[PDB]
Amino acid sequence: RPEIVGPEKVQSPYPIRFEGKVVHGFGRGSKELGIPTANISEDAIQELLRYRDSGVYFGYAMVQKRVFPMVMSVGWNPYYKNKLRSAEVHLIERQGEDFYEEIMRVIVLGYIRPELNYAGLDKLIEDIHTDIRVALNSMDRPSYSSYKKDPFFK
């Protein structure tokens, strides 16, 4: 896997800006895996991501008045046969308490990869760590890092 992805400069459809309240997930908490993920209110992403590819994206997100680089998994609610979009965000290198019910503002800047066939916990953790490394490397480029101060995070 490459250690950096996407064009040198942010390109359409990015940036994708949206906000939603953080809600509880579907059970199996990533907290135990050392990589907590914030589930975004379903009503904030159904149409917005309906035609976006499933997989891992990267960008910046703000919650509790703090901005962080992030990775986000876009998939489907595992409890319904009818396609219902789901989006879970991991705020990179964040330290703090939980933030359920808080509004999270998200700015997606690029795509990392599609869903990978589950190959075990070890492999999953490795893939997530790589996703994080890739996100940070990709956002170290000026066109991307400038979004950490986007007006949307005012």
Ligand SMILES: Nc1ncnc2c1ncn2[C@@H]1O[C@H](COP(=O)(O)OP(=O)(O)O)[C@@H](O)[C@H]1O
């Ligand atoms: N860096 C972080 N990124 C995302 N969520 C975090 C982070 N730190 C703490 N959290 C908290 O972790 C929660 C998710 O924990 P988790 O074990 O995965 O339960 P759930 O299955 O409901 O998502 C989030 O809803 C958020 O309140």
Ligand SMILES: [Zn+2]
């Ligand atoms: Zn979660």
